[PDB]
Amino acid sequence: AENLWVTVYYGVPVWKEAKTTLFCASDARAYEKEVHNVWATHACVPTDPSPQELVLGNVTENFNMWKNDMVDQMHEDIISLWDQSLKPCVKLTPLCVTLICSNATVKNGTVEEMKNCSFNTTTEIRDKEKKEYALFYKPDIVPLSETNNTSEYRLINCNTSACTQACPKVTFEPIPIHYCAPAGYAILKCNDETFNGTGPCSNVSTVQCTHGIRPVVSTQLLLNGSLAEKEIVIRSENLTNNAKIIIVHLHTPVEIVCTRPNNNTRKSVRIGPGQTFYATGDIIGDIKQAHCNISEEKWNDTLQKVGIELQKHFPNKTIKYNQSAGGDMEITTHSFNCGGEFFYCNTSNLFNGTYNGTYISTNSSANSTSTITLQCRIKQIINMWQGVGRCMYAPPIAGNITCRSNITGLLLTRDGGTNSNETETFRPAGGDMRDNWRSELYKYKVVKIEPLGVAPTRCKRRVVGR
């Protein structure tokens, strides 16, 4: 037919899969007042990007949630913002002293897990010490290193690090984060609903920036996420390897109330040149455990439906939910950050004694009914990121602590190498904080555009001046 020649195009639509920095954009409204939030300080940018989603169509490509780097980018960011927010604040180094602790007597009774500690401080004058007292929860306190006297105690941190107080202006709010591609990269969404975390997504869309991610931390139930829009979904890097965590997404959230009832007063204490440190005060009385409430009907149906979805991966056997495996409260309990208090709630009352989720679809209905109720511990001395990042002391909050949230997903594993005869068992377990990001970022990828291209065509030459 005709001779063919190298012709050159710039701005060609093509890309390669590659790692990059991402910009941390925000809803603009926080940084009017919320100076240095513990998550999302004003290091993140008040750009408030409109979600300019564009359907590509006719393109299909391989997403993978497990090998994803945006999760590691978020893990290194959230740690950085936590450390940045604590570094300016008061250090409890001069508070690490001999504490004499007796009982917390309140209004014809005694509080269950708080002790009443007397201790020594300086005034604003280095050579003038004084005595004063503060209430501490038993998990923050330990018997003094030699047991000479059953009333001598110390603050827990002293043999490991000096905890910074979290400044009152530096809040714990879970504000939405939008991650944005720098120039020459695009973010891709997988819009192919019922995609199960890996492989060829059949339906793909571009965006400049992600949906509003919330940097929430809890370790057995997930909180305040995005629902799976079609059906309940199970995700794991290998379901047959029982050590791989099994993230589950709900289609209808369960409403959880987490609460305290005590009435409580806040106290200010100093050992210095000037500073303030906040400490716990005297009480007005009716007495209950701090607790959380879940609807029996809604929960029952929710664990039933997950049993059916797991039976499609594990056929001809009965699936039973059970207690968290063992160890200390830091992994065996549902962690939290409600209202500015770090709750730690037992769940052995909740993942319990359940028969075949498919056969339970027979039951699957009730009238209005009583709450499942979870007993909670609370503590103030925190080693937040599983040992890494600084120790933090959370200052106490006066009076009215309570919050309401949506359960949107669960962090299961299968049980150990049992006989497995007619049966399989599943347990809640918390793992690494990364899974709290994978349970939102699973449907994203970042790609680098490679805008040059060469192709044959019948354009013969750039004949001089033609």
Binding site: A1, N3, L4, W5, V6, T7, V8, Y9, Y10, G11, V12, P13, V14, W15, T20, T21, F23, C24, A43, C44, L54, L56, G57, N58, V59, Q84, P88, P182, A183, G184, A186, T206, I449, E450, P451, L452, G453, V454, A455, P456, T457, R458, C459, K460, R461, R462
Partner: protein, 126 residues
């Protein structure tokens, strides 16, 4: 407005209508997080200038669609012309031709556009 990458599933003969819409977006823009923004932007500028310089060496500077005097080799690719332009996406073509990048670029430099500009200087000698 088809939008940024809005033709990535379209045929090469339809995607090659949109080159300005995309190319206008290859360039945009108590704390160290400013070092993210600077290290991202200076890299995005540096990548863009490496494309512009490379288009200057081949003799296309300031064009998007451009034509050159180098003929095709059947070893690079050899299919019917409609099976290219009327039929496949740039994303699909890129995965076919990718062996002959660096081969074609080194051929465009000395063995075409330097040589055209040698002959131009020997001509304007008059």
């Amino acid at each position: 407005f088809l939008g940024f990458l809005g033709a990535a599933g379209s045929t090469m003969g339809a995607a090659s209508m949109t080159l300005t819409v995309q190319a206008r977006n290859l360039l945009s823009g108590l704390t160290v997080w400013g070092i993210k923004q600077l290290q991202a932007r200076v890299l995005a500028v540096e990548r863009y200038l490496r494309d512009q310089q490379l288009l200057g060496i081949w003799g296309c500077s300031g064009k998007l669609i451009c034509c050159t005097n180098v003929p095709w080799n059947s070893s690079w690719s050899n299919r019917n012309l409609s099976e290219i332009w009327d039929n496949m996406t740039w994303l699909q073509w890129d995965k076919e031709i990718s062996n002959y990048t660096q081969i074609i670029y080194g051929l465009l430099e000395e063995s075409q556009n330097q040589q055209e500009k040698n002959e131009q200087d020997l001509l304007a000698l008059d």
